[PDB]
Design an enzyme around this catalytic site. Structure first.
Site, PDB file in Angstrom:
ATOM      1  N   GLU A   1     -90.012  85.997  62.604  1.00 31.99           N
ATOM      2  CA  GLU A   1     -89.187  87.191  62.535  1.00 31.99           C
ATOM      3  C   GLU A   1     -90.091  88.410  62.592  1.00 31.99           C
ATOM      4  O   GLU A   1     -91.076  88.488  61.861  1.00 31.99           O
ATOM      5  CB  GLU A   1     -88.368  87.224  61.248  1.00 31.99           C
TER       6      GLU A   1
ATOM      7  N   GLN B   1     -79.673  96.921  61.355  1.00 29.93           N
ATOM      8  CA  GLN B   1     -79.157  95.803  62.141  1.00 29.93           C
ATOM      9  C   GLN B   1     -79.207  96.135  63.627  1.00 29.93           C
ATOM     10  O   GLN B   1     -79.331  95.248  64.474  1.00 29.93           O
ATOM     11  CB  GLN B   1     -77.731  95.434  61.726  1.00 29.93           C
TER      12      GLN B   1
ATOM     13  N   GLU C   1     -87.890  82.077  64.761  1.00 29.17           N
ATOM     14  CA  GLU C   1     -87.358  82.136  63.409  1.00 29.17           C
ATOM     15  C   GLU C   1     -86.168  83.083  63.386  1.00 29.17           C
ATOM     16  O   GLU C   1     -86.332  84.300  63.422  1.00 29.17           O
ATOM     17  CB  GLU C   1     -88.419  82.623  62.428  1.00 29.17           C
TER      18      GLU C   1
ATOM     19  N   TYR D   1     -82.441  97.852  52.149  1.00 32.48           N
ATOM     20  CA  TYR D   1     -82.255  97.224  50.845  1.00 32.48           C
ATOM     21  C   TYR D   1     -82.119  98.253  49.734  1.00 32.48           C
ATOM     22  O   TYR D   1     -81.568  97.962  48.672  1.00 32.48           O
ATOM     23  CB  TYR D   1     -83.414  96.282  50.522  1.00 32.48           C
TER      24      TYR D   1
ATOM     25  N   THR E   1     -90.282  80.369  56.836  1.00 30.14           N
ATOM     26  CA  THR E   1     -91.672  80.760  57.038  1.00 30.14           C
ATOM     27  C   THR E   1     -92.638  79.609  56.757  1.00 30.14           C
ATOM     28  O   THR E   1     -93.426  79.225  57.622  1.00 30.14           O
ATOM     29  CB  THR E   1     -92.018  81.987  56.172  1.00 30.14           C
TER      30      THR E   1
ATOM     31  N   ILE F   1     -82.038  83.528  53.220  1.00 32.52           N
ATOM     32  CA  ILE F   1     -83.275  84.131  52.764  1.00 32.52           C
ATOM     33  C   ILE F   1     -83.855  83.232  51.684  1.00 32.52           C
ATOM     34  O   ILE F   1     -83.171  82.905  50.719  1.00 32.52           O
ATOM     35  CB  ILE F   1     -82.999  85.509  52.168  1.00 32.52           C
ATOM     36  N   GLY F   2     -85.113  82.835  51.847  1.00 32.57           N
ATOM     37  CA  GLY F   2     -85.769  81.972  50.883  1.00 32.57           C
ATOM     38  C   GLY F   2     -85.451  80.506  51.125  1.00 32.57           C
ATOM     39  O   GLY F   2     -85.498  79.688  50.203  1.00 32.57           O
ATOM     40  N   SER F   3     -85.132  80.174  52.373  1.00 29.18           N
ATOM     41  CA  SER F   3     -84.803  78.803  52.734  1.00 29.18           C
ATOM     42  C   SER F   3     -86.022  78.035  53.229  1.00 29.18           C
ATOM     43  O   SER F   3     -85.907  76.889  53.667  1.00 29.18           O
ATOM     44  CB  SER F   3     -83.698  78.775  53.790  1.00 29.18           C
TER      45      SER F   3
END
Ligand SMILES: Nc1ccn([C@H]2C[C@H](O)[C@@H](CO)O2)c(=O)n1
Ligand SMILES: Nc1ccn([C@H]2C[C@H](O)[C@@H](CO)O2)c(=O)n1
Lengths: 191, 195
Positions: free
Chosen positions: A35, A64, A87, A53, A17, A12-14
């Site tokens: 995604e 999931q 993605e 979350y 996008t 996440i945050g790689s």
């Protein structure tokens, strides 16, 4: 049948996008599937992403489960294009996110088992097109940074610990392991 | 890939098993698929059936999802017989059991929603063979007796009202709200002691 498919994997945050936004101007010759977060944010009204979350032990299972569904829909959606970039995938959903949820206790054993049974039935039936995996490798710290810059309502509480675990899992799967001849993996320094 | 298929439906304790035994002798021409209950009782070590009855708010969702999977497996399993008989189906799970868990409050919106979305996808992709439905119709009271004498561990705390809800749901599905694109329906009097 599906054309040559490429799976963009990463924490996440790689920058996934941002990265695949580049490919947007070529949507005419390339099938681009980001995604289905908008789907996760609105399942007939409910925001599964938000609930997960907010209360993992309660919503990790249905979440999931739905993610598997939507990733499966994306993997099997037909197209006329000869290239397909997705993605993330059902592989990362299984080997990283689910496994991580099992470890931290969000998924009770019986829940993990149910999801695994579904992953087995799918692979035993619904073949998945995967010819190339580009792995945007990053360090948890940098990933944490990106997430912090973009104020994502749901990701407003993901601890650095969480990112590290996801990171390790992505490493165990895409790097410290021999890969099948059916699929190649391209590692890029995101940072 | 699927031959003529018959789905046997009924409330818990409607004598499905007993009834399905009359079909053992024809095993050479008939593919008989029993409810994968023992799978539900052993999901790689965990008893999902037990957990569901013990704490539905937490286990109804995973249980029904595994049910969908196992039923889907039966609905699409190999066979080389010209007639197929299944005990229950994804349809009874979706329209009766899941609906019941929604009404009684065990399934929260997002969970019920997730389950429903899988149903839409399963039927958009695969096709489920269903030519005839046999409905072992019973009264909730009679069904309660069966369950009582059966003394099944996991159903130990099933109150009459629960079977009452499921009964109404089967009734609405197989009788009242029934329509001409009909999977033909044969209604049997399962109150009969043994047929
Ligand atoms: N199997 C998955 C796939 C994605 N995500 C989440 C991580 C991020 O918060 C968001 C994607 O940016 O989706 C998740 O929890 N589980
Ligand atoms: N969709 C289903 C199918 C079966 N069962 C339960 C009812 C019985 O307790 C047992 C089957 O005999 O499993 C259930 O809760 N939900």
């Amino acid at each position: 049948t599906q054309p040559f498919t490429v799976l963009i994997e990463g924490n996440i945050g790689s920058g996934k996008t941002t990265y695949l936004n580049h490919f947007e101007k070529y949507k005419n010759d390339i099938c681009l599937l980001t995604e289905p977060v908008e789907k996760w944010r609105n399942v007939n009204g409910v925001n599964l992403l938000e609930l997960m979350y907010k209360d993992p032990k309660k919503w990790a299972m249905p979440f999931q489960s739905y993610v598997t569904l939507t990733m499966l829909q994306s993997h099997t959606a037909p197209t006329n294009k000869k290239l397909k970039i997705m993605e993330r995938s059902i592989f990362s959903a299984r080997y990283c996110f689910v496994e991580n949820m099992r470890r931290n206790g969000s998924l009770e054993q019986g829940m993990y088992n149910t999801l695994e049974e579904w992953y087995k039935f799918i692979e035993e039936s619904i073949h998945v097109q995967a010819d190339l995996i580009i792995y945007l490798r990053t360090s948890p710290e940098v990933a944490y940074e990106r997430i912090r810059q973009r104020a994502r309502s749901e990701e407003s509480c993901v601890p650095l610990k969480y990112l590290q675990e996801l990171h390790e899992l992505h490493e165990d799967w895409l790097i410290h392991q021999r890969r099948p001849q059916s699929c190649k993996v391209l590692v890029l320094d995101a940072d």
